[PDB]
Amino acid sequence: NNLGTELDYDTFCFYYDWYGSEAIDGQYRHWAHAIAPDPNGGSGQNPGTIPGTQESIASNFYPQLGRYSSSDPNILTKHMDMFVMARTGVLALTWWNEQDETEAKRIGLILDAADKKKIKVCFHLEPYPSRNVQNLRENIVKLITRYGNHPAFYRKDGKPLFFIYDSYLIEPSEWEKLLSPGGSITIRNTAYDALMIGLWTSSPTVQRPFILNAHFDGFYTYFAATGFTYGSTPTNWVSMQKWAKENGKIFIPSVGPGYIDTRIRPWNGSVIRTRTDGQYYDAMYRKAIEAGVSAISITSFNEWHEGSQIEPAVPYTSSEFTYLDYENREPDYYLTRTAYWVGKFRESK
Ligand SMILES: OC[C@H]1O[C@H](O[C@H]2[C@@H](O)[C@H](O)[C@@H](CO)O[C@@H]2O)[C@@H](O)[C@@H](O)[C@@H]1O
Ligand SMILES: OC[C@H]1CNC[C@@H](O[C@H]2O[C@H](CO)[C@@H](O)[C@H](O)[C@@H]2O)[C@@H]1O
C-alpha cells in the first residue's frame, strides 16, 4: 500500500507504564504523586502530595481516558490504536528495573498489545539505583533473552535499540568497557549487541568527546522544552546532525508539543512552554525534519506530569483544580498532527 497512513519505524514515542487504577492495581499510582521541594528554596519544606483523586491528579492536564491503569489490557488496546492514528511505529518504554512481578506482567501485556497493531517496542533505560555498566549489561542480556523473540521487539538492521536517560551520570571510561569493540565487557560482536543512544545535553565542547569516548551509536535530546539544554534548542540541530554524520553516529532529536510540570514542581515555571493550539509542536517538528535526520523521537506519549503528552486530554474543572486542555483543538489533535508530521518526515527521508 501507498496510502500515506502506514506506521513509521524510525519514529519513537516515549511511553510511560507507571499509572495505576482501581480496576486493575490498588493505588492510583502516579496520578497520586509527591510534590517536589524547590531545590533553591527554604529548609523545612513540607511540599506535600497530590492525592490522585478524581478531582486532583498529578498533571496540569486531564486524560480523556481518566485515571487509567497501565496494567489494564483495554487501556493498552486504546493506546495502540492511538499510536496507529499518530503513525508512530515504535513505543519507547520507560524501564526502571523494578524487579517485581507487576512490571513483568505489564511489559508482556504491552508487547502483546503492540504486536496486534504492528507496533514495535524498545526500552528507555532510566537512572535506576546504582545503575552502572555491569548491571546495564546484565539487564540488556535479560531483556534481549526474555523479549528478543517477541514479534514486537524492535530491531533496526538486525539490532535492538536502547535509549539511555541521563547517560552522563556514568563516565565515558566506564561506557567504553561496555560499548567499545575492545571493551572488557563489550556487547559488540556478541548476541547482545544493540544500538545505544545516549543523551546529548550541553555544549559540543563537552558532548562531542563524551559521545565518542563512550562509544555510543547515537544520541537523542529528550526534553520537550525548547532551550532547556543546548541539545533541546532546535537551532542547534543542523550542526548536531552534521557532526553525527561526520562521526558515524545516529542523531534522534526529540520533539514535543509543550511542557508544564508545575503541579508536581511548582517552582519550575520558567520551563513552561505554551502549546499555542499546536504551533509550538509544528515549529519543533519542522526543525527536526529540516535538520535532515534519519529518525525522530517524540516527548511524549504520556508523561502527564510534565505536560508533554500527545495522548488525548479533555477539558476538566473540578472543585480542586482547573486543568489546562487542548484549547481550540479537539482531544485527538496531537495524534492526528503527529501523523501529519510523520508524513512530512517520510517525504523528506
Ligand atoms: O529540575 C527540573 C528538571 O528535572 C529533570 O531533568 C533533570 C535531569 O534529568 C536532566 O538531565 C538535567 C538536564 O540539564 O536537568 C535536570 O537536572 C526533568 O524533569 C526536567 O524536565 C525538569 O525541568
Ligand atoms: O523518561 C525520562 C524522564 C522523563 N521525565 C520524568 C523522569 O522521571 C522522574 O520524574 C517523574 C515526574 O516527572 C517521576 O514520576 C519519576 O519517579 C522520576 O523522578 C524520567 O526519568
* Ligand 1 first shell, C-beta below 6 A: 166, 201, 223, 229, 268, 271, 306
Q: Whose CA is nearest to atom 20 of ligand 2?
A: 126
Q: Supply 274's cell numbers.
A: 505554551
* Atom 21, ligand 2: residue with shortest CA distance: 126
CA of 300, nearest ligand number: 2
- The kind and range of the H/E element at 308 are none
Exposure letters 302-333 (e unless 16+ CB within 10 A, then b): bbbbbbbbbbbbeebeeeebebbbbeeeeebb
Torsion of CA 320, 322, 326, 331, to 10 degrees: 40
Q: Is the CB of 124 under 6 A from ligand 2?
A: yes
Ligand 2: centre distance to CA 167 (Å): 14
Which ligand minimizes its atom distance to the CA of 125? Answer: 2
State in Å: Cα 157 to ligand 2 middle: 30
Nearest to 122 by CA among 224, 13, 220, 250: 13
Among protein residues, the one whose CA lies closest to atom 23 of ligand 1: 271
Cβ atoms 131, 169 nearer than 8 A = yes
Q: What are the b/e assignments for 239-263, b being 16+ CB within 10 Å?
A: ebbebbeeeebbbbbbbbbbbbbeb
CA-closest residue to ligand 1 atom 11: 166
Angle at 59 between CA 87 and CA 110, to 5 degrees: 40
Which of 96, 125, 199, 228 has the most ligand 1 atoms within 8 A of CB, as the residue to mutate? 228
**Rounded to the nearest whole angstrom, what is the distance from the C-alpha of residue 164 to the centroid of ligand 1?**
14
Chain-centroid distance of CA 64 in Å reads: 20
Q: How many CA atoms does the CB half-sphere of 257 hold within 13 Å? A: 30
Q: List 317's β-bridge partners, or say none.
A: 322
Residue 38 CA, ligand 1 centroid: distance in Å: 13
- For residue 328, CA distances in Å to 174, 272, 275, 276, 325 come to 49, 19, 11, 9, 9
End-to-end Cα separation, the chain, in angstroms: 18
State the cell numbers at 186. Answer: 563489550
Q: Which three cell numbers stand for residue 44?
A: 523545612
Q: In sequence order, what DSSP letters do the residues of 201-252 get, joined into one string?
A: -S-HHHHHHHHHHHT-SEEE----STTSSSTT-GGGHHHHHHHHHHTT-EEE
Closest ligand 2 atom to 127 CA:
21
Resolution in A: 1.3
Distance 70 CA to ligand 2 centre (A): 16
Residue type, position 232, single letter:
S
Centroid of ligand 2 to alpha carbon of 347 (angstroms): 33
Spatial CB neighbours of 70, under 8 Å, sequence gap ≥ 6: 16, 17, 18, 19, 20, 76, 106
Q: Do 234 and 284 form a contact (C-beta atoms < 8 A)?
A: yes
Q: How far apart are the CA of 268 and the centre of ligand 2, in A? A: 14
Spatial CA neighbour of 244 closest among 286, 200, 279:
200
Give the distance (Å) from ligand 1 centre to CA of residue 151: 34
Residue 303 near ligand 2, beta carbon < 6 Å: yes
Angstrom distance (rounded) from CA 183 to CA 241: 27
* 151/112 Cα distance (integer angstroms): 9
Question: Which domain covers residue 312, as residue numbers?
Answer: 1-349
Q: Is the CB of 305 under 6 A from ligand 2?
A: yes
Domain total for the chain?
1
Q: Give CA separation, 177 vs 33, 174, 186, 217, in Å.
A: 37, 5, 6, 14
Alpha helices of 154-203 — where are they, by DSSP H?
172-179
DSSP for residue 304: G
Cα torsion 101, 107, 113, 115: sign: negative
Please tell me the residue having the least CA distance from ligand 2 atom 4.
Answer: 303
Looking at residue 214, which CATH number applies to its domain?
3.20.20.80
